[PDB]
Design a protein around this ligand. Structure first.
Ligand code: CS
Ligand code: NA
Ligand code: NA
Lengths: 91, 91, 91, 91
C-alpha cells in the first residue's frame, strides 16, 4: 500500500519533472520543485507556466495528481510515523 | 455521481473563466488557469485580481467552489483510479 | 450548526480585516481578501506581511482559523448544496 | 494527544526555522514564517528557496511535515475549540 503509493507518487513527479524542464525550460531540480509544490497545493510565488501548453498540462496535472499525492501523505503519516512516534510514547 | 461532480466542476470553471477574462481582462486560458489554481488552493504567484469586483468575486468563488472541486477530486481518485491501478495489482 | 459556523467564520475574517488594514496598512477590501486566501490556503502571490507583528499574527491566525474555515466550507457544501443540487437529480 | 501533536509541530517548525535562516539566509522570523506557510500549504508569493539544497530540503520537508501539521490543526479545532465554543451554545 504505502509502497505502491510511494511508487505512484514518484512516477507522477517524474512526469512533471520531464514536462516542465522540456516545455517550460526549467532546470530539472526546479521542474521537480514546481511539480511538488503544485501537487501539494503549496504553490510557488515566483514561477507560473508561461506557455499555453504548460498551463493546460498544469490544470490536468493538478486534477489527476492531487488525489494521489495526498493519499500518499495520508498513509505516510498515519501508517509510517504515527506508530514510530507513538511507539516510544509507550513507557 | 462522478459524472454529476464532473459536470458541476466544469460549469464552475466556465463561470470563473468568463468572469476573469471579462472583469480582469485575462486571456481565456489564463482565466481558466487562475480559476483552477484558486479553487484547488494551489494559487498563482504572479496574478491576483486587480479590481475590487474581482476581489469580492474571488472571495465568494473560493467559498462556494472549493467544496465541489475537492469532492470531485475525491471521487475521481477514489472511484476512478483507485480500482484502475488497484486492478493490475491483482496478479 | 451551519449558522454558527457561518457566524464564527465571519468574526474571524473581520478580525483579520481589521488587523491587516491597521498594522499592514492594507485597504479594508485588500485586508479581507488577504485574510480569505490565507485561511483557505489559496495564498496571494503579491502580498506577504511586511512587519514582524504581521508575520507573527499571520502564523497564529493560520493555525487558529484554518480549522474553522474548512469546517464551514465542509458543512456549506455537504449540508447546503449537496441536497439543493441533489434535489433536482430526483426525477 | 493534543500535547504531543503540539510538541511535534513545534520541533518541526524549529527545524525549518534553523534550516532556512542558515542555508537560505533568512532572518529567523522570516524562516519561521516560511516554514509555517509552506507546511500549511498557504505558500508565500515572494520567497522561494534559491539554493538547490533549499529546494531539496523543502520538498522533503513538505512531504514529512504536512501530515503532522494538519493533524495538529485537526485536533486543535476538534478537541480544543469545538467544545469551548460549543460550550456556551448550551443555554
Ligand atoms: Cs497555496
Ligand atoms: Na492548500
Ligand atoms: Na499559494
Amino acid at each position: 500500500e504505502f509502497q505502491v503509493l510511494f511508487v505512484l507518487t514518484i512516477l507522477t513527479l517524474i512526469s512533471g519533472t520531464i514536462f516542465y524542464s522540456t516545455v517550460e525550460g526549467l532546470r530539472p531540480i526546479d521542474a521537480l520543485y514546481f511539480s511538488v509544490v503544485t501537487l501539494t497545493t503549496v504553490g510557488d510565488g515566483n514561477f507560473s507556466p508561461q506557455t499555453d501548453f504548460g498551463k493546460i498540462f498544469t490544470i490536468l496535472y493538478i486534477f489527476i495528481g492531487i488525489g494521489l499525492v495526498f493519499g500518499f501523505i495520508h498513509k505516510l503519516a498515519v501508517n509510517v510515523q504515527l506508530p514510530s512516534i507513538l511507539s516510544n510514547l509507550v513507557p
